[PDB]
Each structure stands twice: as C-alpha cells, then as structure tokens.
Amino acid sequence: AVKKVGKIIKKRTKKFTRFQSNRFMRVKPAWRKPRGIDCRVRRRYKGTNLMPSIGYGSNKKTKFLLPNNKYKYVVKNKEMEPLIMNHTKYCVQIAHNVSSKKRKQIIERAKQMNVSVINAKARL
Amino acid sequence: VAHNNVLPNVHLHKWWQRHVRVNFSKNIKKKKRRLLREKRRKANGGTPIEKLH
Amino acid sequence: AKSKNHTNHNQNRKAHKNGIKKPKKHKFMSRKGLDPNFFRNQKYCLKGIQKKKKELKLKAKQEKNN
Amino acid sequence: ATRFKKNRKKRGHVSAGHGRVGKHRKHPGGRGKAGGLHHMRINFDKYHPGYFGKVGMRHLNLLKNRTYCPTINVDKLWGLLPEEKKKEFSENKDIAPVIDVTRKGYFKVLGNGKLKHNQPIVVKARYFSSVAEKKIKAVGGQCILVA
Amino acid sequence: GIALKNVGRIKKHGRKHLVSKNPYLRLLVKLYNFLARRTNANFNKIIAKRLIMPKRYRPPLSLSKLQYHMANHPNDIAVVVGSITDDKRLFSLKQLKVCALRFTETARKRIEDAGGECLTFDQLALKYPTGKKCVLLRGPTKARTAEKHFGKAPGKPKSKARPYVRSKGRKFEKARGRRKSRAYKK
RNA sequence: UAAAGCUAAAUAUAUGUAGGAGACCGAUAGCAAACAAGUACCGUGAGGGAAAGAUGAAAUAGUACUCAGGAAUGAGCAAU
RNA sequence: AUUUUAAAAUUAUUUGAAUUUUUCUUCUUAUAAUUUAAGUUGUUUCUAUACAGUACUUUCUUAACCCACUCGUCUUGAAACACGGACCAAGGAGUCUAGCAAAUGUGCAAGUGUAUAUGAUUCUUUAAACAUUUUACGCAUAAUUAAUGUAAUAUGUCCAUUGUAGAUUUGUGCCCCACUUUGCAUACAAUACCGGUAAGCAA
RNA sequence: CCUAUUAGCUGGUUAUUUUCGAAAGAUCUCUCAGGAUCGCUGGAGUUGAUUAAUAUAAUUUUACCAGGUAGAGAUAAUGAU
RNA sequence: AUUUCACUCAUAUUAAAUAAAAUAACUCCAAGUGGGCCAUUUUUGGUAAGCAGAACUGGCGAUGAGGGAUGCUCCUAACGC
RNA sequence: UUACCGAUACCAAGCCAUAAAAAGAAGAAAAAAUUUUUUUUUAGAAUCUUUUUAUGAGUAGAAAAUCGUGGGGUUUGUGUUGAAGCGAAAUACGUGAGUUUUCGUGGAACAUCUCCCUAGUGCAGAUCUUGGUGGAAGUAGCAACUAUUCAAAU
C-alpha cells in the first residue's frame, strides 16, 4: 500500500525480491529480470512476485528528499564549506571510515553551523 | 560470405602462429646501431668511416 | 519428414504492414530505344532551337557588354 | 576499449544476440567462399557478376615498370607553376612559361580542360594526345618532344 | 488500447543533438539555434540545422564553383557550411566574399591576394543576422565515392553501381554476365 | 664467360646462463611445480603425474603451577 | 517578479435605453470592492506541555479473506507420465589478430601518411617524445579494350553544356501570400565528348 | 604427437530500466534439421511538412471498364438419360 | 513534337466525400527469420479423424486481465503506478 | 420486464517515463515578536529550466541511459582513537541493478562519481570442474571353512 507522510508521497514499499528466491538458497534476494520462456513472472500471472517497472517512480518534485524534507550529503574530513548557504536543504552524514577525533571535530563544527547530522552517535 | 562485401582474400589458411614475429626492439636496435657506429668511428683516429661513391 | 509444400497465409498483411508502395512517377521518360527515325529528327529540332536561342543570347550579351 | 562492445549489453540473455531457434553454429553455410555455383550462387550473381570465367590473353612477366606513365590533364598546367609567376606571365605579352613536366614527375599530357585564350605555353613531355596538341596549338602554344 | 500508427507517438528523423564534441562548434550552434529560436528568419534555422549535419554532408566547395555561382550577382556574400578547397584548375579569381567553417592555407592566400576577406560565422552573425545579402551554398553531397556502391545492386539490369573489387585488372570481375560471349550480359 | 674454392657486416633465437624491467597473475590464479618437484604415487612399458604458503613484534614470550583423572585431556584462584 | 491581469459575475451608486413589462429583467457611461472569477480555505481540539513508552514510524514472526502447478530448455504445443538440476562456495563462455566495407568524431585537403631508416649535451622513468637540405613509395587525381595502345566540349571566352521543378537572394505590392531576379544540393531527363564494338567510307 | 582435428547436430551462453519490435512465405540449392536471397524489423542519416494543403488512403461515392462462380437449363450446342 | 510569348482555368472549403493524411519519401548498415498451428466461412482425398492439403480474414505463437467450474486459440477486452 | 453485482477495458483526478509541443543566454515577499530585530528563500545548470498534450504489452531482435569489478593516469582524502572484509540490521535513498550507514568481530591498508583509458569483469543451471556437507541412516550389514567352556595371571 502507498504510504503518505506529510508531503513526500511514496507509492511502494517492500523492496522487491527475486522470483524463486524463497525455496532456493543459491538465489540471493537481489532482484533480477528473469528471462526464461514459460517463466510465469514474464507472463505476469495473477498475483505472483510482481516485477518493478517505471510507473512506481516517485515524483521528481520530491524524489530524492529524505523524511527530513532535506537531501542528504556525505562528508569526510572538513568539507563543510559548500554547506553554509543551503543549511535548510542539505543534511550531512559522516562517512563510515572516519575516526573518532575527526568525527568529533566535524560534529562540533556542524552543531554550531546548525545543520542536522544523521549518525551523530557513531563509534562513541 | 554475407551480401555486399569484398570477396575475402585472406592468405592465413596455413599455420602462422609458428611464424609470427613482431618487432618491439626497433628503437633500442637503432640506439645500439648508433652506439656501435659511433665507437667504430671514434676508434679510427677521426678518419670518417663513410666512403666516396 | 513431411514438409508443407506451399502457403500464402499472412502475405497480404505483411505487404500492407509497410503500406502498398507506389512508383515514384517521375516526369520525363527516357527515349533510349523508342521508335527511332522520329526522335532522330527531334534531336536536330532541339539542337536548332537551342542554337538560335543561344546565338541570340550571345548577340544580346555582346551588344549590352560593348 | 572492451566494455563498448555490443556483447557487453546482452550478458543476461541466454542467446547472446545470436538467435535462439536457429542457434549459433560453427560455419553454417560452409567455410570460405564455398557456395559458388552450387547454393550461394545467387549472391555472386547479384553482387559480383563477372567473377567467374577467364577472359583475355596472357602477359607472362608484365614488369609493370615499363608501361608506367602518370597522367596530367592540360588545364592543370598553369596550376603547376606558382601563382606569382602565373601573374607575371599573364601580365607580359612577350614571355611564355616552359614546363618540363619530367621535373615534376609527370609523363603524359591529356586534353581535358580549358586553357586561357590568347596565351602561348611551351610544354615538354614524353607523350602527348591529339586533342591536347590541338588545344595547345590553338592558342599559340607549342608541343616539344623530350626523352 | 487505441488504433494509432506507432501507438500515437510522433517520430521524427534526423539529429536531435550534435554528437560532435568540439567546444567552439558547440558554442557556435548554441548561438545560431538561439538566433533561429528568437528570430523568424528561415536563414538562421537552415544554417543551424546545417551546422549539425555529419562530416559527409558538409562537403568541400571549390573556389571555381563558388565564383561561378556568384557570377550572377557580385555584391552578395556566400555562406557555405563546410570548408572551401582551393582548385589549381582555376586561373584567376575576382573579389569574392565568403563565409565557411574551415579553409586551406593555399585558398586563404589566394583569396587574400584576390582582395576579399574570410568571414567566420561569428562575423556573419554580428554583421548580417537576418540573412540579408547572403546566398547559401553547399558542395556536391552525393559525388563522394561511397555513393558509387549505392542504388541498384551491381548486377541489376541497367544498374550503374561500382562493385567492390581488389583491383581492376583483366581477371577481376570481367568475364561472366558482363559480356555476351560468356553467358548473358548485365 | 658455367661445370674448382675462400670470406667479417648488415641478420635469429619457445636452448642454457647472467643481468634489468612491467597499465601481467596473486595460492582452484600464475610454469606441472611460491613448500622436500618432475618428488610422492600409478602402470611390468612406452609413459602418466599430483595436494600441500600466512601463530606471533619477539617463541632468546610455544603453554610453567595446583587439582581431577591411567593417560589423554579438562578446571582454576595459577599462568605468556 | 512584467495574462492569478483583462474582462466574467455579485453587491452598492450612477448612464442612457430597452423589452418579454420588472425585487435573480437585460444591454453599458463611469466608481469601490467581493468571487460563483483566477485547482481548499478557515475554526476547535489531540499529538502535547515529553525526550523513549503500550503512543508514534519501521522491520521481523505468526495468523486471517483472495489468488498462486518446479524452474531452465528444444518445441505449434511444458507443470507435465518430455530432458538436467540433493545441497553449498570459488572458477566458467562472442575474445584477439590480418583485411575490407559502412556509420560516427578529428586533422589536413588536390594532396595526403612520414616506412624502413637517419640526429640528438633525450638516454632512472625514456622499449617515448622531439626532428626529417628544393620527385621513395602506397592510396587519389582519368577512363577504357583481350591487346599493340588510345585517352573527356574547344579557343569562340577566366562563357565554366541545356531543360523541369527545387533551397536560398534582390525588390514590388521590419513580420504572410501573389508578381520579376538569382537556380544550392538533388531528382527526372536531354545534349555533347573519350575509350570499345558495330555499320558506311576508306591511302 | 599430428590436434585445442572436423562436426549442417544436442546442451549451455552471467546487471537493470526505457524505446521500437518480427517470421514461420516466395526463388535456387547432392537442398528437405542447413544455406544465399529478397519480404517482414531496428539503428543511422538526408530531402520534403510544420501554411487544418498537396503528395498520400487495405475508405466510400460519380462515371467507365473486364470476368463465366454459385444460380438456371435439357426443346440452345456436346455428352448423357 | 518542341521552345518563347500571348490570354486564363474553382483556389475566399480547397475541379466528389472523409481523413491524429508529412508518424511521410529516400538512402545506407545490420540481427532474427526461413519446421507453424487454431477458429467462422469456401473447399480437395479419404467413411471418418483432435487426419492429410489449400483459400479471404482474425488470432495463437510473441499475451496476460474478467467470464466459459476447469482449457495455448471461445466471448468481453489487450496491460505504466 | 425492471433492479442489480461484475475488469489491469471506459470516464474524472493525481504521479512516473517517452515522444512531441509552447517558451527562456535579473527583482524583495511573508510571518513572529516589538517603527527595530529574528525567522525561510531571493532561482538562469541547454543531452538544462518552466509549462501543455498524448501515449504507455511484448519472445527472438536492436539501440540509449545506466550500476557495479580487477587495474591505470589525473584531482583529493581516509587510516592504531582500527581500514579492507564478514555476520545482523537500518523511521535510509532509488523503480533497479545497488549505494550509503549503525552494532559486533577484525588487526593493516583503502576510494575517488572530478574527467578519462584499459580489461582474463558481473552466473542457478552446461549428466559443468574443483573442495566441503546432507537426507537416505545409527539403516543395509558385520553368514562360507562344524565349537567352544571354566579357573587363574597380566
């Protein structure tokens, strides 16, 4: 069912799973388009692992923005200069390969910059 | 053969891996020849190696 | 193995898929080998009229170009 | 440059872009040009009519070195020489160029073109053509043999 | 569903973008397509379309043909989308005003000595944006050799298609179906 | 100007050896073989022919001592 | 942020008139706002007076109504009483070369390519880059016939063959169409001219 | 070892989405499980339209054409009967 | 018969009607394809066949959705969420 | 004879993508406190930005935009305050290959999506190969050659 929250209108959840990935371990949950001949999914039988298509794509007016109504952006060491102007539009996430000292300085600068952080409590 | 192409004329019908030999050593062979001829003229007391024709 | 010896099914639909093509219907038709001893005269006719028209053209061109 | 190949777009397609019902088989028709006059003759008769049969007498050792003769049409003669010399020759009514085409590397002079009226030119070539000679002499020029 | 040819989507034919990845020419087309969009003159539209054509359809145009085609009216400026090649088969040239993309040093020297000036498309835009007093020309598109293999298949009755041959000796495609003596002919 | 003869250079190297390199492979890859390899092994013979790298900084830090069990091994408060 | 404006209607004035003959009767002269114009705005609560919870968003497991035949394959016809698949991890298949053609992009352009090779205070990287005394060759500039060979208007003029349309172009009625001016490219023809073979003549 | 011989035949031939999208005819084939060929398709590019036209139409109408199937015959031919 | 001139033949709905008629026309490169089948109607051989073989058209294949309990082809109807 | 129920067909509206279409190479709005401060923006990227309409099925088959992998120049970083990997997971993003994160383990390297060059590059299968593990199962079975019993030592 479509989920409606504020202004972001999402049309689908339950990230799609590969056909037959239930009773076959070697088939991983990552989706693929089965080619086959009589492969059911291609025929689109009534109610059996319906496949992704273009129609499920959300609205580009709101597409990439996160429930924070704010696009996310990665940071590594000190790259906060391009964030000063658009503090109402871009949230910042620390890269997972950042040590505690650098992450501490980044969180210090960001908090006074007044920009939200996603993984604030990382490795501490 | 497939429609409007030239008639194939490839003379590779016999074994040719046995005889393929590319020349990677062009420039270094040139340098070796230069050094050899320079030494040949240097050892000759300054007399030019070339001959009138 | 028995093989179907002929059919003409689906041929009309294949023909009309691209639409029945029409000849280009150009204006002039060549006279390479049509009823000679008439176009033999006609070629001389054209040469004569062209000669008169072009010689008058050159006469006018000279009398206007001094 | 390998990922630009067509094959890199059909990895998950079973047939690899070479058909399913027909299948891809090694040398279906026959190796080389094997279909001559038996089953591939329609292609030969449609694209290379005169491929089959032999015509003409035999030159044993042609030795192409003998009958080598580059050709120059008669109009390009003025273009051969530099344009400033062209201007001075055109200006003067008393001097005419001499073009020994052997120096440039040309042998025969052919009659195609349209020279400049009332201007003589001297030409020296191993061979001439009748129409070229007529054109040259019609404007006061001279054909001079050389060897 | 609907009963529409090509399911009701309009399909054109031609270049939708310049595949030519060349910054100066990209800037130039950015200028002329804008001129076409703003103005209503077909001249700008045509020249913008012609700057997008492939390399094989902006062909060289020789000085002889260019001068011959301006022989009717002497005061106008020629615009040719391709480059103009010098022709050694011409003797003298007279006061020609041209605008092309590329040139050849011999042609440039010849035209400068003649006394004209090589207008580039920037100068053409700055001087005559409405196409005034400019005649549009292009060299022979189909005269290129690869078109000699086109048309009817070589071997068709009354066909004039050069067939692909390794050479033109007396044993290369000269016997069967080309002379009455050996089977049919043509 | 045949039916006698000689000769360095310009040229080739999937051999052996000795050096030097790499938009090459990185332990099912790369030579069959990174290690005790043409070894173990198979076939009476011509011959066929493998698997197997990484403790740790330092084992000149490689498991001392107690208890239980025949010993293996186990547990500790004991110990690197 | 230069059509959420115009008018369109409504109210309340005013203007003249009208007619179906008057409290939604109509047509505007002039005025100010309303919106039925010109895509849903307002009011009251709750979340809630808290920093993680039973609330709130989400993952997972269970159930519930409805539906759903093992995939891959050759095949007109696959879930088949057609064949391969006990399971897992790794490896595993349109590549490379020569030659040609086409499409595209680039340089140069009647020329093009610098080949072998040459010179250099280049000589870790340098087995690359740089450079090439006034026709070396390939491919192209002209074709054709078995072949001796022959070889593209023709000197009236540095016009550059002729038609039918045909892009532009200069103007007449700175944006259309009809009138004369140029006639790209090309398309369909016609002409000449070169080789070849016929035919007539023929020293 | 030649040799990784050849195999018109069997099996396989690995990531997404979007756009377009078929044939199982016809000629020839020591051809009938194959192949070449046009026909159907895609991609590319060009000329013409963008001016409710002109080309154009699996369309109908107006005019003008050609056929010998059903049907009808046995006294109109032939053959019956 | 040709060329050049006269003159002018609806053209403002357009030498009948109607046209999502320029989604055209052409040229080039190329894959797959080249065993078909079912259905109303016509029809050949055979007694007949879910047979063998053709004909105009549509489908199936290449395709699911609702119905015929159920079904590769029947009826409605062809699929972005 | 009415009334009804009945589709991924039809109609109205919303959103996606494709194609076409119309058009484009520089200025202050509002709210809250109390005229002054605070609060949000003040946009101009042409294979783009704004807007309109139509359409949306597909095997063999072709093209485009794409997402990852081993390397390589080029820019610019992360690393003992623990990187690469791996297990579990995420009010996480896409439509989707996947990307990005938190916790635990780990003990030395890792990415570049700034643009590009290159390739032994993406797996479920091939009675695929190599290595390991199942159910079948504590089951079949441990059968010929007649036969062993007691007491003690060890």
Instruction: Measure CA E41 to chain center.
Output: 21
Q: Which of E110, E171, E176 lies at the smallest CB-CB distance from D49? A: E176
Q: Is E8 helix (H, G, I), strand (E, B) or coil?
A: helix
CA distance D32 to chain B (A): 7
- Is C touching A (3+ C-beta pairs, cut-off 8 A)? no
D 2-41 near E (Cβ less than 8 A):
none
Query: D20: burial class by Cβ within 10 Å (0-12, 13-18, 19+)?
Result: exposed
The letter for the amino acid at B34 is R
Q: Which chain B positions have a beta carbon within 8 Å of E165's beta carbon? A: 6
CA distance D75 to chain E (A): 6
Nearest CA to D80 among D125, D117, D118, D134?
D125
Distance of alpha carbon E86 from alpha carbon D71, whole angstroms: 21
Whether A10 and A64 have beta carbons less than 8 Å apart is answered as: no
Q: Which chain B positions have a beta carbon within 8 Å of E149's beta carbon? A: 4
CB contact under 8 A, A33 and D12: yes
Regarding beta strands D71-73 and D108-110, do their DSSP bridges make them parallel or antiparallel, or are they unpaired?
parallel
The three state secondary structure string of B40-52 is HHHCCCCCCCCCC
Distance of alpha carbon E156 from alpha carbon E70, whole angstroms: 41
Beta carbons within 8 Å of E173's beta carbon, 6+ residues apart:
D48, D49, D50, D51, E163, E165
Chains adjacent to E (≥3 CB pairs closer than 8 angstroms): B, D
- Is A touching E (3+ C-beta pairs, cut-off 8 A)? no
Distance of alpha carbon D56 from alpha carbon E170, whole angstroms: 7
Helices E105-114 and E63-70: crossing angle in degrees, nearest 10, is 30
Two tokens at E45? 């539209």
Beta carbons within 8 Å of D56's beta carbon, 6+ residues apart:
E170, E171, E174
Whether E85 and E61 have beta carbons less than 8 Å apart is answered as: yes
Beta-sheet strand order (sheet of D142-145):
D98-100, D122-125, D142-145
The letter for the amino acid at B15 is W
- Residue D45 CA and nucleotide G194 C1' are separated, in Å, by 30
Whether A21 and A48 have beta carbons less than 8 Å apart is answered as: no
Helices (H), E51-103: 63-70
Nearest CA to A110 among A89, A95, A122, A94?
A94
Distance of alpha carbon A41 from alpha carbon A50, whole angstroms: 7
CB contact under 8 A, D43 and B7: no
Two tokens at A116? 């939200």
Distance of alpha carbon D89 from alpha carbon D75, whole angstroms: 16
CA atoms within 13 A on the CB side of A121: 0
DSSP E166: S
Q: Which nucleotides of I are covered by protein (CB under 7 A)?
A: 1-3, 20-38, 52-59, 62-66, 77-81
Distance of alpha carbon D44 from alpha carbon B1, whole angstroms: 10
Q: Which chain B positions have a beta carbon within 8 Å of D47's beta carbon? A: 3-4
Nearest CA to D35 among D21, D52, D18?
D52
Distance of alpha carbon C52 from alpha carbon C50, whole angstroms: 5
Q: Which nucleotides of J are covered by protein (CB under 7 A)?
A: 8-10, 14-20, 24-25, 40-41, 46-47, 54-65, 68-69, 77-84, 91-98, 100-104, 117-119, 121-122, 124-125
> Which residues fall inside 7 Å of strand F, measured at CB?
B 17-18, 21, 29, 33
Q: Which nucleotides of F are covered by protein (CB under 7 A)?
A: 11-14
Regarding beta strands E77-80 and E98-99, do their DSSP bridges make them parallel or antiparallel, or are they unpaired?
parallel
CA distance D38 to chain A (A): 38
CB contact under 8 A, E166 and B6: yes
Whether E35 and E44 have beta carbons less than 8 Å apart is answered as: yes
The three state secondary structure string of D64-131 is CCCCCCCEEECCHHHHHCCHHHHHHHHHCCCCCCEEEHHHHCCCEEECCCCCCCCCCCEEEECEECHH
Distance of alpha carbon A77 from alpha carbon A103, whole angstroms: 8
